[PDB]
Design a protein around this ligand. Structure first.
Ligand SMILES: N=C(N)NC(=O)Cn1c(-c2ccccc2)ccc1-c1ccccc1
Length: 364
């Protein structure tokens, strides 16, 4: 009920956000990672060391084989499965049940994470990048086609023995829950419908323009992906960023392992938040020379591990606006209007606030 959908996501810091879902008949319960950076509905369907629970096609009276496998390799692992179809529901989402394609994973390589608690993955991006090809209708596409839920979904990623801290959030499917944000919603166009691709026109490491040709901010592409933790930047922008960040926090000093994202830096509640600057990402607006900025605090790019890890890393796939950027913002994936809206979140110190400000006046 939007209301029924509030706080329907759980996660372990840095390990993603999942939503409970059910598959088959009787309903099999599973936690599924919400990924706007992929397009397959893939779930474990065979025993695994990190899996304490998986999809059993055998118990589903409504399961249907497609006889057609799916092999998906990547630099580090893979997941192989058998393609199928079955009934799927989201208990704390819309009150509907649709028949969707399901990639039943039977063999994997560094796919599943130890102790994350999700058993599958919900690829929420377009068919362009779906495996094995674009003929395998992504889950959301089946949802809208069958039920008559509106082509749009929102994500309010929130953030925060010893254990990784637990995170919470909401995935409101079919609409916009106005109590999840304050201020107005600024939309940036979806450049192309494959990944949720957008355009960054300018960047600032607190007031200072990085002054690069904007094509660099999107060198290759720029995407909004909940399935990625860190804010990943093209090598050139990345180094320009760290330099600026190191120059502003210098009244403090740390090792390279820290900036290379592979090392923590701890202080308790003494944390020097204010030495670290805010990062402003201006996104192309709906009107050609109009843009708007989303400003993020160190509380965002310094992920807790008191200890923290630098949540900004280098990339050769382009820019990736991951969880650490989406947090503190209510993000709207308006597939119907082909755009993405940003607004300060209900989720979210007394000197600086994350912000969504506009407007401002060849980047892709
Ligand atoms: N980068 C993304 N947005 N999405 C993926 O990489 C999805 N993905 C994939 C994947 C690769 C190609 C096509 C469909 C899914 C393999 C492993 C993951 C994964 C698993 C757990 C946590 C994070 C990623």
């Amino acid at each position: 009920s939007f209301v029924e959908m509030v706080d329907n996501l759980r996660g372990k810091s840095g390990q993603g956000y999942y939503v409970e879902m059910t598959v088959g008949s009787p309903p099999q319960t599973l936690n599924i990672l919400v990924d706007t950076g992929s397009s397959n509905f893939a779930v474990g369907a065979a025993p695994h060391p990190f899996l304490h629970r998986y999809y059993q096609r055998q118990l589903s009276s409504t399961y249907r084989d497609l006889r057609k496998g799916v092999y998906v390799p990547y630099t580090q692992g893979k997941w192989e499965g058998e393609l199928g179809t079955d009934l799927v529901s989201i208990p704390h989402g819309p009150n509907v049940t649709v028949r969707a394609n399901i990639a039943a994973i039977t063999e994997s390589d560094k796919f599943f994470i130890n102790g994350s608690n999700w058993e599958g993955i919900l690829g929420l991006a377009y068919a362009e990048i779906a495996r094995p090809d674009d003929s395998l209708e992504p889950f959301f596409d089946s949802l809208v086609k069958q039920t008559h839920v509106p082509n749009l979904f929102s994500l309010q990623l929130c953030g925060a023995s010893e254990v990784l801290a637990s995170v919470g959030g909401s995935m409101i499917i079919g609409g916009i829950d106005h109590s999840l944000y304050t201020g107005s919603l600024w939309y940036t166009p979806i450049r192309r419908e494959w990944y949720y691709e957008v355009i960054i026109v300018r960047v600032e490491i607190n007031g200072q323009d990085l002054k690069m040709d904007c094509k660099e901010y999107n060198y290759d592409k720029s995407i909004v992906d909940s399935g990625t933790t860190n804010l990943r930047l093209p090598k050139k922008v990345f180094e320009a960023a760290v330099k600026s960040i190191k120059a502003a926090s210098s009244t403090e000093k740390f090792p390279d392992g820290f900036w290379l994202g592979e090392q923590l830096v701890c202080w308790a509640g003494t944390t020097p938040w204010n030495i670290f600057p805010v990062i402003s990402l201006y996104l192309m607006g709906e009107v050609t020379n109009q843009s708007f900025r989303i400003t993020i605090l160190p509380q965002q790019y310094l992920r807790p591990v008191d200890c923290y890890k630098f949540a900004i890393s280098q990339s050769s796939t382009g820019t990736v606006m991951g969880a650490v950027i989406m947090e503190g913002f209510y993000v709207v994936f308006d597939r119907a209007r082909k755009r993405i809206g940003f607004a300060v979140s209900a989720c979210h110190d007394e000197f600086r606030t994350a912000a969504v400000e506009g407007p401002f006046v060849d980047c892709g």
